[PDB]
Amino acid sequence: SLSESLAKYGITGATNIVHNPSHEELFAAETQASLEGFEKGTVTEMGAVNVMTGVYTGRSPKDKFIVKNEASKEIWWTSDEFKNDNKPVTEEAWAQLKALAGKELSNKPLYVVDLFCGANENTRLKIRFVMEVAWQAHFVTNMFIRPTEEELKGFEPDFVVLNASKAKVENFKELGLNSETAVVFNLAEKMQIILNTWYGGEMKKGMFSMMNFYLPLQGIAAMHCSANTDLEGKNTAIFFGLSGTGKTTLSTDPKRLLIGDDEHGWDDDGVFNFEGGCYAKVINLSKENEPDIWGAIKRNALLENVTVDANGKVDFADKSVTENTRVSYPIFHIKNIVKPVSKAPAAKRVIFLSADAFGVLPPVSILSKEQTKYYFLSGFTAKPTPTFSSCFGAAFLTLPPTKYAEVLVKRMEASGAKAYLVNTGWNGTGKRISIKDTRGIIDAILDGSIDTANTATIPYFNFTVPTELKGVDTKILDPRNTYADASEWEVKAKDLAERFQKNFKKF
């Protein structure tokens, strides 16, 4: 019954089929002396296993393609006017890429893991993974929702993923690809193929990209955000923000239940985590800085590319092999989370984080309906160089960005949601905004105390800021106050504002 399924995927000769292996069976498989190359896992003193991914220690967007056929007509293809990662490939290239994948995963002991993407029983996608590497199977097991074996009784995959990382594509030039590495999706066969890259993020983000396709087409918002609720599991808040924005640190509060930290949906029932685990960065990690993550790194957690000595002593700071060192682990490795399902009611507060190095945006701004869609489509942050990433995850958008902003705002008007553009960056002082101020601003968003605060308005950007906020220096509330002369602020403001118009041009 599973042999014909693999035969349907182009895989034949399965000597052994391990279906939905338990963490125990995974550990044993990972710690096998026979394991050669990057398949081998090593037990660290922390109990968690660690593996190397070889040449790729991160995503490779240039090798990501989607088969150009009728099934993908609604895909937001890249073009001269607006370039995105959705690069077209021919049906011819797919046949050969599916051949390679099928062959590489034929006549050998395979692992098949049937899992769910999305915590809401309804509107969820059934995903089938197939790989020949135990730790790869272990990764998806940590990162996705694990069915109850009962749900696995008659599991019918909505989308199938073949990880053929040990194989590659030498004839990549002829097939129209970019290199021997290939991550291709086919909506007609509902299948994703991974070739020549062991970075686990290809599996996680590949499905996220697919969820970003199917959910929005059904009125379900697909979001690249983190989400939490109060200790009671109500008053859901979703956090958006690119790297360096402090999205995690600002959504990880003792008096807040964690729903998820990366991928969420918003259907009629509310906000739900797409994932069953967390894929955290552990570079320069610290038990004193990240108690949650640290305590989550144990047996069953999967360390990826972290340097360890012969005795198993992990050095979370060694940026040797890569700075993108990660760790995956079941969500339940974190205590403060919503249970028993990562789902919650419609979000009440929506916040867009921005690390504005320009020191122009105010600490927090009450966004309007139109402005909400705008800054969402903007996905602004700063490193004085700006970086824009539509919907805070432009590389995963399989549909036009305006469609994500659309469904999002629609779901907001149904629960009386309010958006906030929060600046966790800098001001005029040059020094970064205090974490005590921003975090106090977040509190004002959650506790709703920001609803009664008076406003003022800010030229150019036409923002609405609270003249007063409990737990926040009244001086910082206005971006001008931190500058010698209001003229200086206007100069940068006029410039930054100009950068928004230019970037929004393609939209």
Side-chain angles (χ1 to χ4, degrees), residues 1-2 4-7 9-31 33-35 37-39 41-69 71-72 74-91 93-120 125-148 151 154-155 157-172 175-233 235-254 256-286 290-322 324-334 336-372 374-382 384-435 437-467 469 471-472 474 476-484 486 488-493 495-501 503-504 506-507:
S1 183
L2 198 168
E4 41 186 43
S5 286
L6 292 176
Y9 308 141
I11 292 172
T12 62
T15 74
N16 190 189
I17 293 173
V18 178
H19 176 268
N20 285 56
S22 51
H23 286 290
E24 353 294 314
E25 291 177 301
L26 290 160
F27 180 74
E30 293 165 348
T31 62
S34 72
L35 296 189
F38 310 110
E39 282 198 62
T42 304
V43 185
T44 63
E45 65 171 42
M46 294 189 78
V49 177
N50 173 260
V51 301
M52 315 274 266
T53 56
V55 170
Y56 290 97
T57 51
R59 272 188 305 94
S60 183
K62 296 178 197 294
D63 305 306
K64 185 175 163 185
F65 296 81
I66 303 183
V67 193
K68 189 80 177 63
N69 52 38
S72 58
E74 302 299 346
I75 282 290
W76 175 46
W77 301 104
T78 178
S79 65
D80 201 345
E81 41 271 54
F82 203 147
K83 179 198 288 187
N84 62 49
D85 294 324
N86 301 146
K87 287 174 303 304
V89 74
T90 69
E91 290 259 21
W94 174 263
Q96 282 193 60
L97 296 174
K98 187 180 179 178
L100 291 163
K103 285 174 287 175
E104 174 59 48
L105 292 173
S106 283
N107 311 298
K108 57 179 55 181
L110 300 173
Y111 290 88
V112 176
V113 194
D114 291 331
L115 302 155
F116 290 132
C117 190
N120 196 256
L125 297 209
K126 302 179 195 189
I127 325 298
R128 165 161 292 163
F129 288 98
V130 185
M131 53 277 278
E132 62 184 289
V133 181
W135 75 255
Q136 287 177 163
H138 174 27
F139 173 95
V140 292
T141 304
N142 276 186
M143 298 316 291
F144 289 97
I145 313 288
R146 298 149 293 257
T148 60
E151 300 180 0
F155 189 100
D158 306 2
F159 203 96
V160 174
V161 180
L162 301 182
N163 185 313
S165 59
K166 295 180 68 52
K168 63 183 185 308
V169 190
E170 304 147 299
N171 57 316
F172 68 82
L175 290 169
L177 308 182
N178 167 260
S179 72
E180 312 190 278
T181 308
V183 181
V184 190
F185 301 81
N186 185 318
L187 314 194
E189 309 188 15
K190 301 175 182 57
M191 175 186 299
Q192 172 196 195
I193 292 181
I194 299 176
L195 292 156
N196 202 47
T197 168
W198 304 64
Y199 181 61
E202 292 300 349
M203 294 190 266
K204 168 186 155 63
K205 292 303 178 176
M207 290 299 102
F208 180 50
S209 286
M210 292 298 100
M211 299 291 282
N212 295 336
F213 179 70
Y214 298 115
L215 275 61
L217 295 181
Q218 309 171 59
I220 304 170
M223 325 174 281
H224 196 183
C225 71
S226 69
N228 64 201
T229 66
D230 54 41
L231 295 172
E232 292 179 51
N235 306 130
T236 300
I238 61 180
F239 293 67
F240 286 90
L242 303 173
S243 289
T245 222
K247 197 165 88 317
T248 301
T249 297
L250 297 180
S251 55
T252 305
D253 183 290
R256 276 275 157 172
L257 298 184
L258 197 277
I259 298 174
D261 62 346
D262 205 36
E263 305 162 19
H264 292 87
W266 194 338
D267 56 28
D268 296 343
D269 298 325
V271 179
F272 60 91
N273 192 165
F274 279 4
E275 313 177 281
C278 298
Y279 190 46
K281 306 194 66 171
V282 297
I283 190 62
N284 302 318
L285 186 68
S286 181
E290 294 81 53
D292 296 59
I293 303 178
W294 190 274
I297 300 183
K298 51 200 177 67
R299 187 50 51 91
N300 298 326
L302 193 55
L303 291 172
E304 195 186 47
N305 303 127
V306 307
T307 38
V308 305
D309 61 37
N311 292 316
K313 189 152 65 187
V314 181
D315 182 8
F316 292 110
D318 185 25
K319 301 184 157 179
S320 179
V321 182
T322 168
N324 185 208
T325 49
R326 301 272 198 156
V327 67
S328 56
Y329 51 78
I331 183 69
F332 56 74
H333 268 206
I334 297 303
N336 284 37
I337 64 169
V338 180
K339 309 182 167 182
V341 188
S342 305
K343 69 202 283 188
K348 298 298 176 179
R349 332 297 287 189
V350 178
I351 87 143
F352 299 149
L353 301 175
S354 286
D356 184 40
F358 290 89
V360 174
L361 306 177
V364 53
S365 304
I366 324 307
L367 258 53
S368 71
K369 188 179 76 296
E370 297 304 299
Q371 299 185 303
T372 283
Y374 182 91
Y375 294 93
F376 182 57
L377 289 166
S378 295
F380 171 78
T381 189
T385 172
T387 147
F388 297 91
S389 179
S390 185
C391 314
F392 305 87
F396 311 114
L397 271 32
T398 36
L399 292 161
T402 43
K403 179 65 177 186
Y404 297 86
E406 172 197 0
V407 182
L408 171 68
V409 183
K410 183 235 282 182
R411 291 288 178 190
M412 286 177 70
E413 300 205 302
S415 66
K418 288 168 185 166
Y420 299 101
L421 176 56
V422 175
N423 176 44
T424 50
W426 298 256
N427 251 168
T429 323
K431 53 151 72 73
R432 185 159 186 146
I433 295 187
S434 86
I435 300 176
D437 281 306
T438 174
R439 192 184 289 290
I441 292 175
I442 289 302
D443 288 347
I445 300 295
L446 313 188
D447 77 335
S449 68
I450 190 175
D451 291 314
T452 47
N454 307 309
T455 71
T457 304
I458 299 184
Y460 311 110
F461 285 100
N462 299 312
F463 283 146
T464 299
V465 289
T467 55
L469 283 187
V472 184
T474 305
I476 197 175
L477 278 305
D478 192 305
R480 318 195 203 78
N481 297 61
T482 174
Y483 280 102
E488 169 171 48
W489 175 82
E490 284 162 50
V491 176
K492 312 181 68 174
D495 170 51
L496 180 53
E498 172 177 334
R499 292 169 176 287
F500 277 81
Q501 308 191 351
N503 171 274
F504 202 80
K506 53 191 171 191
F507 292 78

Short mmCIF file of all heavy atoms in Angstrom, two decimals, residues 91 271 343 350 361 372 384 455 499 502, unseen atoms left out:
data_model
loop_
_atom_site.label_atom_id
_atom_site.label_comp_id
_atom_site.label_asym_id
_atom_site.label_seq_id
_atom_site.Cartn_x
_atom_site.Cartn_y
_atom_site.Cartn_z
N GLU A 91 8.54 21.20 -17.98
CA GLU A 91 8.05 19.88 -17.59
C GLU A 91 9.15 18.88 -17.93
O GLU A 91 9.25 17.82 -17.30
CB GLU A 91 6.79 19.52 -18.36
CG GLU A 91 5.57 20.33 -17.99
CD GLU A 91 4.65 19.57 -17.06
OE1 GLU A 91 5.13 18.62 -16.40
OE2 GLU A 91 3.46 19.93 -16.98
N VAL A 271 -5.80 31.90 14.91
CA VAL A 271 -4.40 31.78 14.54
C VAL A 271 -3.82 30.42 14.88
O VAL A 271 -3.98 29.95 16.01
CB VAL A 271 -3.58 32.87 15.23
CG1 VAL A 271 -2.10 32.74 14.86
CG2 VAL A 271 -4.11 34.24 14.83
N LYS A 343 -2.72 26.25 18.55
CA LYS A 343 -3.75 27.04 17.87
C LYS A 343 -4.34 28.01 18.89
O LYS A 343 -4.30 27.76 20.09
CB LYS A 343 -4.83 26.12 17.30
CG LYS A 343 -5.68 25.46 18.36
CD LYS A 343 -6.37 24.18 17.86
CE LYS A 343 -7.59 24.46 16.98
NZ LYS A 343 -8.33 23.21 16.69
N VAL A 350 -1.73 43.15 15.99
CA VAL A 350 -0.78 42.77 14.94
C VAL A 350 0.37 43.78 15.00
O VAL A 350 0.15 44.98 14.90
CB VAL A 350 -1.45 42.82 13.54
CG1 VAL A 350 -0.43 42.47 12.46
CG2 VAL A 350 -2.62 41.86 13.49
N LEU A 361 11.70 56.30 12.30
CA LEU A 361 10.40 55.81 12.74
C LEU A 361 10.25 55.95 14.24
O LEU A 361 11.22 55.81 14.99
CB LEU A 361 10.22 54.34 12.35
CG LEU A 361 10.43 53.96 10.88
CD1 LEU A 361 10.27 52.47 10.76
CD2 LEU A 361 9.44 54.70 9.98
N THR A 372 -1.53 49.68 7.15
CA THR A 372 -1.22 48.32 7.56
C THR A 372 -0.80 47.50 6.35
O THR A 372 0.24 46.86 6.37
CB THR A 372 -2.43 47.64 8.23
OG1 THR A 372 -2.56 48.11 9.57
CG2 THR A 372 -2.26 46.13 8.24
N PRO A 384 24.10 53.15 6.93
CA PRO A 384 22.64 53.27 6.94
C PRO A 384 22.02 52.73 5.66
O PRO A 384 21.73 53.48 4.73
CB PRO A 384 22.43 54.78 7.11
CG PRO A 384 23.58 55.35 6.36
CD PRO A 384 24.74 54.47 6.80
N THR A 455 -2.90 60.99 20.95
CA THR A 455 -2.04 60.91 19.78
C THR A 455 -1.39 62.25 19.44
O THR A 455 -1.32 63.13 20.29
CB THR A 455 -2.85 60.45 18.56
OG1 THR A 455 -3.74 61.49 18.16
CG2 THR A 455 -3.67 59.21 18.93
N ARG A 499 12.85 56.32 0.06
CA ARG A 499 13.25 54.94 -0.22
C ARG A 499 12.03 54.01 -0.24
O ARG A 499 12.02 53.01 -0.96
CB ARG A 499 14.28 54.48 0.81
CG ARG A 499 15.62 55.18 0.69
CD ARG A 499 16.50 54.87 1.89
NE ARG A 499 17.84 55.45 1.79
CZ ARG A 499 18.79 55.00 0.98
NH1 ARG A 499 18.56 53.96 0.18
NH2 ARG A 499 19.98 55.58 0.98
N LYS A 502 10.24 54.41 -3.67
CA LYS A 502 10.99 53.76 -4.74
C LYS A 502 10.76 52.24 -4.72
O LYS A 502 10.42 51.63 -5.74
CB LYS A 502 12.48 54.08 -4.62
#
